[PDB]
Write a structure and sequence with these properties.
The structure is a monomer. The protein is of the alpha/beta class. The protein folds into two domains: 1-459 and 787-810, Glycogen Phosphorylase B (Rossmann fold, 3-Layer(aba) Sandwich); 460-786, Glycogen Phosphorylase B (Rossmann fold), CATH 3.40.50.2000. The protein has 33 helices and 25 strands. Strands 1, 4, 7, 8, 11, 12, 13, 14, 18 and 19 form a ten-stranded mixed beta sheet that branches. The chain has a six-stranded parallel beta sheet with strand order 22-21-20-23-24-25, sandwiched between helices. It has a three-stranded antiparallel beta sheet with strand order 15-17-16. A hairpin with a 5-residue loop joins β16 and β17 (412-414). α1 (10-27) packs across α2, α22 (550-566) runs parallel beside α23 (588-604) and α22 crosses α31 (751-765). Bound molecules: 1-beta-D-glucopyranosyl-4-naphthalen-1-yl-1H-1,2,3-triazole. The site of 1-beta-D-glucopyranosyl-4-naphthalen-1-yl-1H-1,2,3-triazole has 19 residues, from α6. One of its GO terms (molecular function) is pyridoxal phosphate binding. It catalyses: [(1->4)-alpha-D-glucosyl](n) + phosphate = [(1->4)-alpha-D-glucosyl](n-1) + alpha-D-glucose 1-phosphate.
Length: 810
């Protein structure tokens, strides 16, 4: 049908049709008479999967023969979403499979909707890992994703009476056709025990053993025949575990609970023992596998020349003392050589400056669970503080600030300090975030070792985030500039010469309208809610957190409603305001914000005076596959975090690529986005980081804003008096109290500029042609934000490897 989706050749369609019928019969044990739509999806999944295997076997064979430097991306989260359409896209099978299934009398899009998201992540940090795997394969790097195969991913979010309810995400219920179990690579992981000192070094004895069984998922590059591996560990009890008899067998679940469920915290460091076990489990199993593969290529001097380990936050930070443990205790290298290998192998990426997010493990926990690693950490710290003392003589406070061991009520290990000390490179995820790291939380470390500190601005994959989710836009772009931009997103600059092109202007606008119509229908068909597709689609989608200021959005929405009620017969640009995201189950305020949003909607959506001029919708169960639907449909992207709090953002980049304009603060990657597009083409408002600092020194007094802004006072009075909760007048007392007395993120301080800037958005929207030309200027300058660029920078400046766009033989 459309060009970017590949050729539908006669030979291919015939072959796909027959393999589909073979799988339906032989693999699913069905015929067309009793086959469910789920069987049809599975037959298609198996057909497409067959096209991966040849390439997967010869990519891994290629890496054995060539022996390149291997990249190991260690993460507790891989937010993958669905695999079927992405596989077709990267293999150029999409039109062919579409045609083949059409001829079989099936609708492929309906079949695609049956696949469960692999929801093995919470939000931005997990999705980054997934975009990274895609870019690494596309750039022909010998890269492996390593994580945990959770039985249950992020919870499915249900909204009942306006409240979030969580339910278990049983994503493996019907089976996962994309994974291949590799039980021949099952590995032992040790916990507890104690340390014995012999004549010949320390020994870790009396341990409990949990087995780690790997499951391999293919990661196909874009049209280059490269298929890399994401290896995920599953916990298994050994067969003599606890071995009355029945209880012993039932108790096996204690060991296997390690890989049962993803921790759903996007907010507040929870020092739970099960989480620590998860962190060590993935680290211990991965390092054994890395070393095994290294040996199967004695000499550990060359180890860093053949191995790079990237740590996705501090979650796999135990890789540092674990590598030391293996090298010193098992391989009998001396400390200094082992440490040199470790530093040169490891690199650390930070994703937040919020103090409550930092991992600070109680010493008594590491004492019990990992006695040897605690000893190694103490030795690391001692030798590190000796270096600090020699560089800054007499600076006793610097020593205690930089210590990996924090003294207090309970002694803690600071895992971020561990990571910096044990890594040859430390990076932030956007230029401003990376500067904030050097100036504030890691200032002392930067002064000691300035060369370790880097920036690597985040990116998103244009395969999933344009071609897959927005074929219409990819096609009109391809019509003018060809197809090469899909793996070379900088080529989108060539679209700047079409900004005054009347045909292109009309096409860009047409595609958006089609996307909005399709999404407006999806809402009714799946959720029975009626929206006006001619309104401006104002969308804020991301995890619910106070720093992200969904509450500032709420205040604007209430302002618009009150202004309508004040002057009913005045014209206003119609808006559909969509807010979506999950709240961490124990985050009370985040759960209150969800309830506020639905409560606002209850009032706004049923006011006869309002009509269809304003709608407030809460997007339930936001996740990767819903993002693929709503993002192409958006006109306005809300990126309104308090300056200095959003490390980068990646949702922002998705919206920019898909033809939405951005309203945002100068925070994270918004700064670089505005810089690329030009500030005239961006809706910037609010305090800069400097302004936040000034307010903090003086003291933030919310009351001042309440007293001086009559429209704000009215909103707070409506919330307090029970205007949005008639049966429970004091329901939102917590929200008001927080806003008035302990708002860390200064919601009121940005309110005036925000509302004013929102008016400028509505003004532009009244002029479709000038709205669309500004959109073109955004899409055209979005090229920097491809994770292909990000990964090439990691590759060259951290890992020491050269990317390749060359095909492997088919
Ligand atoms: O680098 C990729 C993205 O990572 C995001 N992120 C941060 C976190 C995160 C994990 C664990 C605890 C956290 C606590 C507070 C804020 C974020 C947390 N999860 N995702 C960052 O919040 C976002 O700015 C960035 O674009």
């Amino acid at each position: 049908q459309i060009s970017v989706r590949g050729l539908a050749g006669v030979e291919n369609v015939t072959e796909l049709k027959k393999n589909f019928n073979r799988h339906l019969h032989f693999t699913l044990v069905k015929d067309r008479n009793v086959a469910t739509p789920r069987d049809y999806y599975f037959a298609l999944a198996h057909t497409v999967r067959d096209h991966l295997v040849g390439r997967w076997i010869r990519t891994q064979q290629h890496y054995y023969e060539k022996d390149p430097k291997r990249i190991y991306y260690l993460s507790l989260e891989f937010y993958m979403g669905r695999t079927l359409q992405n596989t077709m896209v990267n293999l150029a099978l999409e039109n062919a499979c579409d045609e083949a299934t059409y001829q079989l009398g099936l609708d492929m899009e309906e079949l695609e909707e049956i696949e469960e998201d692999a929801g093995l992540g919470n939000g931005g940090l997990g999705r980054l890992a997934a975009c990274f795997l895609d870019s690494m394969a596309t750039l022909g790097l010998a890269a492996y994703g390593y994580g945990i195969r959770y039985e249950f991913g992020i919870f499915n979010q249900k909204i009942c009476g306006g409240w979030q309810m969580e339910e278990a995400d049983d994503w493996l219920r019907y089976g996962n056709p994309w994974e291949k179990a590799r039980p021949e690579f099952t590995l032992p992981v040790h916990f507890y025990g104690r340390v014995e000192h012999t004549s010949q070094g320390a020994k870790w004895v009396d341990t409990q053993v949990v087995l780690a069984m790997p499951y391999d998922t293919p990661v196909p590059g874009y049209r280059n025949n490269v298929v890399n591996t994401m290896r995920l560990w599953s916990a298994k009890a050994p067969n003599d575990f606890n071995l009355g008899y029945i209880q012993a067998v039932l108790d096996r679940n204690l060991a296997e609970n390690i890989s049962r469920v993803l921790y759903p915290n996007d907010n507040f460091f929870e020092g739970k023992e099960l989480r620590l076990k998860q962190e060590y489990f993935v680290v211990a199993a991965t390092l054994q596998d890395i070393i095994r593969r290294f040996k199967s290529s004695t000499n550990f001097d060359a180890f860093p020349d053949k191995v790079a380990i990237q740590l996705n936050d501090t979650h796999p930070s135990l890789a540092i003392p674990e590598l030391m443990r293996v090298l010193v205790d098992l391989e009998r290298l001396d400390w200094d050589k082992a440490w040199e290998v470790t530093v040169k192998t490891c690199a650390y990426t930070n994703h937040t400056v919020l103090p409550e997010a930092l991992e600070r493990w109680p010493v008594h926990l590491l004492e019990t669970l990992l006695p040897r690693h605690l000893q190694i950490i103490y030795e690391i710290n001692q030798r590190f503080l000796n270096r600090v003392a020699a560089a800054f003589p007499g600076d006793v406070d610097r020593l205690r600030r930089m210590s990996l061991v924090e003294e207090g009520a309970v002694k803690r290990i600071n895992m971020a300090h561990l990571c910096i000390a044990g890594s040859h490179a430390v990076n932030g995820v956007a230029r401003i975030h990376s500067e904030i790291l050097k100036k504030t939380i890691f200032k002392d470390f930067y002064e000691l070792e300035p060369h370790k500190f880097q920036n690597k601005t985040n990116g998103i994959t244009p395969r999933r985030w344009l071609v897959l989710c927005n074929p219409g836009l990819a096609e009109i772009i391809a019509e003018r500039i060809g197809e090469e931009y899909i793996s070379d997103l900088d080529q989108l600059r060539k679209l700047l010469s079409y900004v005054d092109d009347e045909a292109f202007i009309r096409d860009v606008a047409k595609v958006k309208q089609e996307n909005k119509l399709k999404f407006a229908a999806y809402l009714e068909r799946e959720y029975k809610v009626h929206i006006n597709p001619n309104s401006l689609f104002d969308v804020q989608v991301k995890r619910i957190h106070e720093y992200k200021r969904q509450l500032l959005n709420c205040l604007h929405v209430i302002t618009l409603y009150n202004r309508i009620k004040k002057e009913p017969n005045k014209f206003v640009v119609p808006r559909t305001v969509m807010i979506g995201g999950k709240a961490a189950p124990g985050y009370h305020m985040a759960k209150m914000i969800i309830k506020l949003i639905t409560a606002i909607g209850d009032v706004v959506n049923h006011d006869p005076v309002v009509g269809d001029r304003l709608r407030v919708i809460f997007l339930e169960n936001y996740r990767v596959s819903l993002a693929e639907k709503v993002i192409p449909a958006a006109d306005l992207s809300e990126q309104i975090s308090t300056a200095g709090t959003e490390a980068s953002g990646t949702g922002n980049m998705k919206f920019m690529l898909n033809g939405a304009l951005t309203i945002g603060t100068m925070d994270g990657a918004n700064v670089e986005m505005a810089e690329e597009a030009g500030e005239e083409n961006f809706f910037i408002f609010g305090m800069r980081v400097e302004d936040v600092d000034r307010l903090d020194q003086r003291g933030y007094n919310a009351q001042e804003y309440y007293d001086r802004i009559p429209e704000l006072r009215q909103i707070i009075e409506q919330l307090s008096s029970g205007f949005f909760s008639p049966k429970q007048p004091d329901l939102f007392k917590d929200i008001v109290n927080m806003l008035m007395h302990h708002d860390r993120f200064k919601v009121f301080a940005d309110y005036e500029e925000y509302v004013k800037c929102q008016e400028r958005v509505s003004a532009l929207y009244k002029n479709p042609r000038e709205w669309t030309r500004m959109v073109i200027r955004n899409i055209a300058t979005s090229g920097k934000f491809s994770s292909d660029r990000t990964i090439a920078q990691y590759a060259r400046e951290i890992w020491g490897v050269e990317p390749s766009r060359q095909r492997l033989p088919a």
